[PDB]
Structure formats: C-alpha cells, structure tokens
Design a protein around this ligand. Structure first.
Ligand SMILES: Cc1cc2nc3c(=O)[nH]c(=O)nc-3n(C[C@H](O)[C@H](O)[C@H](O)COP(=O)(O)OP(=O)(O)OC[C@H]3O[C@@H](n4cnc5c(N)ncnc54)[C@H](O)[C@@H]3O)c2cc1C
Length: 251
C-alpha cells in the first residue's frame, strides 16, 4: 500500500467493523452508550467521505436511529435495520485492510482504520464551510462524538483509557474545527510516542512522530528554539492528506 494514500477499503471496513462487531458487543443499546451511538452515527452520515451508496446507507441508518423513541434498542432490533438497508451490498461482508494491513493478523487492522476514520471526520468538518451557526454546531460535535464512541464502544479498553486520559486533560480547550484537527493529530502522536519500540508494535510498521519528513518534509521546523512542528504546514498537509481527492477508490 501507499503511506501517503488512503484506501476506501480501509474506511469502509471501519464502518462495517464498527456497525457489526463493535456496536454488537452490547446486547442492549441504552442510556449514554445509546446517546453516543446516535451522535457518532449522525457525524458519520454528515462527514464520512462516502461514495453515493455509502452516504445513502449512513443517512438511512441515521434516520432510523432518530425515529427510535425507545430509550433502549436491543442489538437484535438494530441488526435488522442494517440488514434492511443492506449494509452488506453497500459496504462488504468481510473486513478489507489495505493501508492498514499488519505484518501479522494481530497487528494494525481495525485500530489503524479507526484512527484514519477519526482523522478524516475531523478534517472533513474543517474543510466544509462552517460560517453558518447551524452547521458550525454540527462541526463542533465531531471530537466529542469521537470521544463518546471510544469510551462506549472501542474494543481495547487499554486503548480507550489512554485516549480518555488525553481527552479529559485538554480536549476542553479545542475551540474550532482546525483546532480539533490539530488536537486529534497531536494526541495520536502522543500515543505514537508511548507505543514506539514497544513489544506490541508491528515490526514492519514502526511508530514515528507522524507525518515523517519522507512523507512531509515541509511539516517540521529546523531551528531547535521554536516549536518542533510548523503547525500551519502540518494543518495544510492534513487537509490535503485526509481529503476525498487523496482517497484511492476501491474499484
Ligand atoms: C483512541 C485510541 C487509543 C489507542 N490506545 C492504545 C494504547 O493505549 N495501547 C496500545 O497498544 N494500542 C493503542 N491503540 C492502538 C494504536 O494507536 C494503533 O492503532 C496500532 O498500534 C496500530 O498502529 P499502526 O502503526 O498501524 O498505525 P496507527 O497509529 O493505527 O495509525 C494509522 C495510520 O494513521 C496515520 N497516522 C499516524 N500518526 C498519525 C497522527 N498523529 N495523525 C494523523 N494520522 C496519523 C498513518 O498513516 C498510519 O499508518 C489505540 C487506538 C485508538 C484509535
């Protein structure tokens, strides 16, 4: 795969994995886990960079949730809605990792696709006009939606505990779409720092403070008495990297 390229197969297997495996770990979707589910889905429908069918599917599922008056939705009930709207023909029946494929089955995979997805949502919401309060409010729900999803659905708790630590510590300081793009970007790099050279690291895919120079030379400053990262150059790299034009459609 290409490190500068994003594969639609990764983003789609992410949606398929989230809907079938992650939400399905809970027999009854209720309370706050349900609220977070609804918020995240609404974010997907609006910002996921999906093709025609995908976006139609997301909107339909999103409309189904909104209509559910029950304050408790058994997964059984939710599974039907996915089936009725045929998430199968829309996404796929099996996960398909490309840029997120690990040197071994237990490496990378979903977690990798979920970060990519989270970053894309942030960028998408920062690459859409938000000068209108109505949508400037929808853009504001991205990071919290992402926080809610991680807490209530993300598989490895080991993983959710470390994100939430960063979240509680400084997410309350993000005051704009680009600010959110950067927060998620640097929070992921903090995680990269913690996991670097760890025994669980994918040998073939060592952690680095991303993006590396080989990927974006203009992103790093040169002087040592100034920030390590040229935030402006980096932000521009992000919007370009996490954009529809950089997505390699799975034809
Ligand atoms: C919220 C969350 C918390 C996690 N916490 C832990 C944990 O505590 N312990 C543990 O073992 N695992 C944790 N994981 C898993 C871990 O972060 C990796 O996903 C995994 O180890 C696979 O790493 P990877 O090298 O394939 O790339 P990943 O880190 O999964 O990166 C996906 C890809 O996104 C890009 N990328 C890299 N850094 C950035 C960045 N800063 N900003 C934007 N894009 C970037 C690259 O193109 C890269 O190939 C967590 C995942 C999430 C989503």
């Amino acid at each position: 795969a290409d490190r500068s390229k994003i594969y639609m197969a990764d983003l789609e297997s992410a949606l398929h994995y989230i809907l079938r495996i992650e939400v399905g770990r809970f027999p009854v979707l209720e309370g706050q886990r349900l609220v977070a589910l609804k918020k995240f889905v609404a974010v997907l429908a609006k910002y996921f960079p999906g093709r025609p069918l995908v976006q139609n599917f997301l909107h339909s599922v999103n409309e189904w949730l909104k209509r559910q008056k029950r304050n408790k939705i058994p997964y059984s009930f939710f599974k039907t809605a996915l089936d009725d709207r045929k998430e199968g023909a829309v996404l796929a029946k099996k996960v398909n990792w490309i840029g997120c494929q690990g040197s071994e089955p237990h490496f990378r995979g979903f977690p990798c696709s979920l970060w990519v997805l989270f970053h894309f949502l942030t960028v998408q919401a920062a690459r859409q006009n938000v000068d209108h309060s109505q949508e400037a409010a929808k853009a504001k729900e991205v990071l919290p939606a992402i926080r809610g999803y991680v807490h209530y659905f993300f598989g490895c708790r080991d993983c959710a505990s470390h994100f939430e630590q960063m979240a509680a510590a400084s997410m309350h300081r993000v005051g704009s779409p680009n600010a959110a793009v950067l927060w998620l970007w640097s929070s992921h790099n903090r995680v990269n720092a913690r996991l670097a050279g760890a025994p669980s690291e994918d040998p073939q895919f060592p952690k680095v403070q991303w993006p590396p120079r080989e990927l974006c030379s203009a992103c790093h400053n040169e002087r040592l008495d100034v920030p390590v990262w040229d935030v402006e150059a980096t932000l521009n790299f992000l919007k370009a990297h996490f954009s529809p034009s950089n997505i390699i459609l799975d034809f």
